[PDB]
Write a protein that binds this ligand. Sequence first.
Ligand code: A1AB1
Ligand code: A1AB1
Lengths: 287, 284
Amino acid sequence: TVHIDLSALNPELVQAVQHVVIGPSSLIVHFNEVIGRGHFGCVYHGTLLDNDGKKIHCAVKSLNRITDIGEVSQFLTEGIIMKDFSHPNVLSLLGICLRSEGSPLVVLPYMKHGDLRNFIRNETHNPTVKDLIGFGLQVAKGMKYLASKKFVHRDLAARNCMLDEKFTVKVADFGLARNMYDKEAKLPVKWMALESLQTQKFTTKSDVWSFGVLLWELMTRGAPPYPDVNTFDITVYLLQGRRLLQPEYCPDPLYEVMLKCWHPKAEMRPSFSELVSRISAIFSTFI
Amino acid sequence: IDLSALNPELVQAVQHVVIGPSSLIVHFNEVIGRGHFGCVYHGTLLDNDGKKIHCAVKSLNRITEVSQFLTEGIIMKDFSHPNVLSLLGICLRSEGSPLVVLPYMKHGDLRNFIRNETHNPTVKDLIGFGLQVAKGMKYLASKKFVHRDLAARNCMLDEKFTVKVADFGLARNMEYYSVHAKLPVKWMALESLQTQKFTTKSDVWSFGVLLWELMTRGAPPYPDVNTFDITVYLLQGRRLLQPEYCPDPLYEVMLKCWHPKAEMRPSFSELVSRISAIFSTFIG
Ligand SMILES: COc1cc2nccc(Oc3c(F)cc(NC(=O)c4cnccc4OC)cc3F)c2cc1OCCO
Ligand SMILES: COc1cc2nccc(Oc3c(F)cc(NC(=O)c4cnccc4OC)cc3F)c2cc1OCCO
């Protein structure tokens, strides 16, 4: 494991990071109880207790990329901004838990019904199209909040959208932004915009493109984007002006919005504020 | 790679499939298909009886995951049908990739065989080769095995000119995060092109194309249609045209396979019955 000398941090930084830190004594991880595994890593069940209060059911995950002392300080400063994020459609972290055993941990509020993609894909779950459009709105409202804070997600998808106990879609981040700037690599090319594939420039406009793909997933009940196209022919596909086709049970107004998101020029794409109003309309009209 | 790293109940349960390195000679000098079908070499499998067996060995260099591979080994090993290429065993080692071993199929793949201009099989032979595949897929279908990549290229011929349905196991590759192979889009079913979901009914669609390959002596499907515009083409209702030497009854079976509604497509048991009648109405 990675033995980090946690006493090497700047006292001023440490004192400015007191609200975001946890302290291993306050946080209980369940290494036996694995809730999921994927590209980023394993996620575990957790038990935090705030202000010597009741047990808070949370999800814990490690960041193995963080090795040296510098990479810790990097993430702590980022965590300050992440903690300040307060929105009903954004899954903000509770805090970071440093330890001398291995790499740092990040604690987030536990999400009962899990990720958005597996939810709609699940056979037992059978939500109507009314709900599927509703999920898209929450992401947009969620992304609108982040957009106002000048946040660039760089990996917006159904998989990175989580349902709580009240089936509330919250935008989650797995730190793709970090990995890119560290190692410069496996990137989500199908969710990436035409700029991102070539230039690797990421903005709100690239997230709008990614949001377009997210809407496609919802309407197809979590189908893999570009399912009749190779992963390494996506650049050519988009260069030739071909986009995703209209799903079977997808309103024309909603698909029209998807096409706006998938505009070759970046500035021509709509803002997240606009997507809230449009999808709100489509949510109301639909039977 | 450590061959006994994870759960040690597998190795006990998967004794039959696993084969010892001592009882397997790999002729690395003799290479099959001139390296067009990956790293496939000749081999000699020492049976516990005594006498040796001519086999073909392939190195699978797409593995770190390992659990999922051996799981399929149990399923593959416990297959046995005249028109299905059986898996002899997998040879694990302390170092190197896993080696899959199969019985040597003399005349190679079916696609190149019918295309081979030197060979001149009659239409009855071609319908004969098509029927064998249906009987092979009937067996696999009955044991709930979705082939996914069913095509002439994935069918093999022995010295008795017996068609065997072979699996290369590349269908388990189809990724979220990629770093800068081909999907069989022209063999894929309509719903498979939209969902990437494969069933026995999706294999029926692919089988329809396989028949079309046979009847055209291994022509390229949809030769004047783009890879990208292949889904729309099928949604428009367009299908492969009737080959020159394709009988009308056999072409109906092809169209029957390419029904947009998947449930409406015929089973492999149903297809065998149809083609048996067609095969028996030919002189030879
Ligand atoms: C059981 O359902 C699930 C419920 C879940 N509930 C809450 C959280 C989950 O996973 C996450 C996680 F552990 C970490 C992070 N964030 C980061 O790592 C991160 C890294 N760097 C910078 C900033 C970062 O964010 C602050 C995001 C997650 F969403 C869940 C996963 C589930 O499983 C999904 C698959 O089954
Ligand atoms: C000389 O003739 C030939 C004779 C041949 N005899 C036997 C096998 C051949 O090719 C195959 C091969 F090497 C590997 C596999 N199986 C797998 O890879 C696999 C991988 N993962 C999981 C499961 C898997 O299956 C169990 C299947 C094949 F059919 C032959 C090819 C020839 O040439 C073809 C061109 O003519």
